[PDB]
Write a protein that binds this ligand. Sequence first.
Ligand code: CHL
Ligand code: CLA
Ligand code: CLA
Ligand code: CLA
Ligand SMILES: CC1=C[C@H](O)CC(C)(C)[C@H]1/C=C/C(C)=C/C=C/C(C)=C/C=C/C=C(C)/C=C/C=C(C)/C=C/C1=C(C)C[C@H](O)CC1(C)C
Lengths: 222, 193, 126, 39, 163
Amino acid sequence: KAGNWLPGSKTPAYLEDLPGSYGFDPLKLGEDPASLKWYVQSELVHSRFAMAAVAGILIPEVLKAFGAVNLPVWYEAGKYAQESSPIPFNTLIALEIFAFNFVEIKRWQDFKKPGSQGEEGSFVGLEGFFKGTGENGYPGGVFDPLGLSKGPGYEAMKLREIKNGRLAMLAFIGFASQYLATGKGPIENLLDHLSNPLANNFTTNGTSLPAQAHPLLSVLKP
Amino acid sequence: RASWLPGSEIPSYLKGELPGDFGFDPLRLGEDPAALKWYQQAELQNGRWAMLAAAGILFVGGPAAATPWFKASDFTYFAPTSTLFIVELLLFAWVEVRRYQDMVKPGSTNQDPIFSQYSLPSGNEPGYPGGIFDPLGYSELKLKEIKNARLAMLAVLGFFVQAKTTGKTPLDSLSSHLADPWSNNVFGIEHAR
Amino acid sequence: GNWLPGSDTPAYLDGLPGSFGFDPFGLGSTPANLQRFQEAELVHSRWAMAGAGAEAQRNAEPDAEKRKYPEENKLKELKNGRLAMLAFVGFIAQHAATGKGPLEALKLHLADPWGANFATNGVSIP
Amino acid sequence: MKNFTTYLSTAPVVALIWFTFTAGLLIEINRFFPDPLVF
Amino acid sequence: SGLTPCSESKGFAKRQKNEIKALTKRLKQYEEGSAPSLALKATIERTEKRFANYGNAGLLCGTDGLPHLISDPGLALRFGHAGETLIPTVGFLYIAGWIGTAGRDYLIASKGEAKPREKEYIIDVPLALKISAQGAGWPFRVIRELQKGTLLEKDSNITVSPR
Ligand code: CHL
Ligand code: CLA
Ligand code: CLA
Ligand code: CLA
Ligand SMILES: CC1=C[C@H](O)CC(C)(C)[C@H]1/C=C/C(C)=C/C=C/C(C)=C/C=C/C=C(C)/C=C/C=C(C)/C=C/C1=C(C)C[C@H](O)CC1(C)C
């Protein structure tokens, strides 16, 4: 186990060997093993989506703060890309539906029957791409072109993926909540916090602590 | 045994096998043997590029050799800035895949691809090759290299931070500190914002 | 020899003509796919070098070698053909990226090797 | 104290405590957020 | 349905004005600063806030001048009425499944005791509080029981009367 999320608590035995495990399941969602396998895949998929999304938000924002690029902010990039997009909105949705239906059905079929997308005659001659590794959530093949899963740092890279994945998931939800609460981008929120941490935080954004539910805010003030 | 802190406990995985082994690992970073081998190679690589960088920064007449090193990219050459980046990327890609393949399987990249008679001698270490990389038989010397590499790494970091806060060249920083050291140093300069 | 000197090539690739051991993703791991992809590489390379009834009679015979070759000259053909498909894809990509023909761009490279290439034009690198 | 807490765990005492909590919660929500018809 | 938004309904405005006028008529029999005057003014303030909030929520009003709720999920989502019935439906169903799952879990846990009926009228309060906290993750567990086949007792194990 990587550790204990709550020192002194009794950690569940079914999480003892999973990568990235801190024994954290107070709601007992993963007590059933089939549920646990499904949730391991779901956590990895959420982690990788959030990882790529937080990269595609933070790196343009960091390079914009450094004066390098001037790409649009993340919550308005849909509008600016759509006007210049040669493909209209409805066609983009239909294409995304088709492509993700295909790839997610292939991933789902591999989850139910491991290695079944790599068998002979499975794909149209290209089935060697998708042989799998016998590990839930770690496909390999085309998805591991450099073959770094065969190296000796593979187990530590699994742990690195999950913890960075959880951090990225929290970060994207923070991006969305910060936009909804302040109306500014994430780097501007960080700079405002760095300028005055006591006064520039969630307790003063006027949304996170609703005024009706917290009457002492309008009272205990200068 | 020499150590960075005489009189303290030494980690059990650092027994002087490696050069420059003074038991310095307060954060216990490289514990598993794959990590320690990778960080050995990375220390060698970063230290050698930092030795070259410290030399090339301290060495710099001529209009080009009067420019700051952090403003050096704005000098005009025979190619646009994009072209040299990709050419350097290509040459580095070739030599780095050679060095990486040596790092994975030792002795795998020892033979000249176009000359079958020209081959690096066997028993080659990953970070310590032989043959045409050692034209003289100069090979105690690894402690010297790792010490100069670490000093150059700290020097290059000092170049980067000094050009970031004061906005000054390294020679200007040394001359400012040599004017009055008790007022022109990291204290006072940063305390004057 | 080897596409990556030091990399261990798969055992199914050894003995094939033009085998430099390049199959990172294992598409030729089965004999049925390896035999058909050998035909596809040869046909692609032959069409790239030169650039219904004929293609139907190509696979009418039940043999194995006759669908591919109906040892030095085989490797000679395979090394020449792969360069031809690389050249044709380069032609398509360069005419898509600069708008000019494949021959005048050679003269543009010769007249300016360091100021006119795929790095400088704003298509191959945004 | 064990016998007393067992009495406090009898069904009507638990019902009284739980429904006092639930009714008080509903009352205080409607005091702090008066007249909620829609979300 | 031919309705009008309450923020532009004349009957809605007339109702607000009439309710305020009745409360103000009650107000002019008390001195300022008295407890009845303060209570009536607080009621007036709440009335004004309520009418403003119901107008600002996009509620539709009938010819009666009163808000009418839209409950078809299609009409609610396309025309901005999901806060009237659909989101309350999700919230209720979540809390109701929580309550039912906590009750089922407590009953199943009590079934294994030596005196199962004792836990039904003398509540194991720490166990009940623990199970009640775990009811937040009820949809995941209940869906897994449904697919696994353990949610339902088999028909051969359930008593039935002669047919
Ligand atoms: C994670 C997906 C996602 C999220 C969070 C957003 C969020 C946003 N987008 Mg973008 N978009 C997203 C995906 C996409 N958008 C667009 C195209 C645009 C345009 C053209 C515009 C936006 C704008 C906006 C903003 C307007 C708010 C809004 O309308 O709510 C939408 C709220 C969401 C949560 C997104 C949609 C719901 C969901 C995340 C879709 C994906 C769910 C899966 C498909 C479910 C699949 C089920 C499986 C199990 C089968 C908002 C910040 C615009 C705005 O800023 O106005 C100035 C703007 O003009 N988006 C496309 C191309 C088809 C997407 C493809 O996935
Ligand atoms: C990825 C983690 C992360 C980080 C580093 C930040 C950082 C920041 N946030 Mg965001 N945020 C997050 C996730 C995060 N947030 C999540 C999950 C939510 C939804 C609840 C929000 C919702 C939010 C709002 C509504 C606001 C901020 C604001 C801020 C600023 C700090 C003042 C504050 O009010 O704290 C936020 C307070 C919280 C209680 C959120 C904490 C959530 C994280 C995950 C807790 C875990 C932290 C971890 C243990 C240590 C972090 C170390 C770091 C190196 C990762 C600062 C720029 C304010 C602002 O934008 O600038 C003035 C502000 O108004 N945050
Ligand atoms: C969709 C995202 C997702 C999913 C499917 C999982 C799933 C898993 N987690 Mg992970 N987790 C996540 C996000 C997720 N997690 C994030 C963002 C963090 C950082 C806070 C963690 C931190 C974490 C730790 C420390 C551990 C796990 C563990 C586990 C595993 C067993 C527990 C379980 O069965 O949960 C099933 C979970 C779900 C079915 C998702 C429930 C979603 C509900 C609706 C959440 C709503 C409440 C929440 C507070 C709202 C978020 C607000 C917040 C963003 C501010 C399983 C693989 C344990 C394991 O053993 O390691 C592998 C373990 O020790 N997780
Ligand atoms: C564990 C609690 C529990 C659960 C999971 C169910 C579940 C069910 N009930 Mg049963 N019921 C219960 C308690 C429960 N009931 C009690 C205490 C009574 C006596 C009042 C009934 C009387 C009853 C009747 C008369 C009917 C049902 C029916 C049903 C079914 C449809 C749902 C429904 O109609 O709800 C309606 C539920 C009620 C009207 C009573 C609910 C009372 C509370 C809210 C539930 C008890 C909570 C419990 C005390 C929590 C303790 C847990 C804690 C210690 C941790 C479903 C099988 C119907 C049917 O059979 O459908 C096919 C039906 O006609 N129930
Ligand atoms: C092997 C494998 C292995 C692993 O497993 C994976 C991977 C890696 C994926 C793989 C690799 C690969 C490769 C790269 C592929 C690509 C290719 C080629 C390029 C094709 C062609 C392509 C090429 C070919 C077809 C060709 C074509 C040509 C043609 C005839 C042309 C035509 C022209 C000419 C006549 C002239 C005129 O006036 C016009 C026209 C008409 C226009």
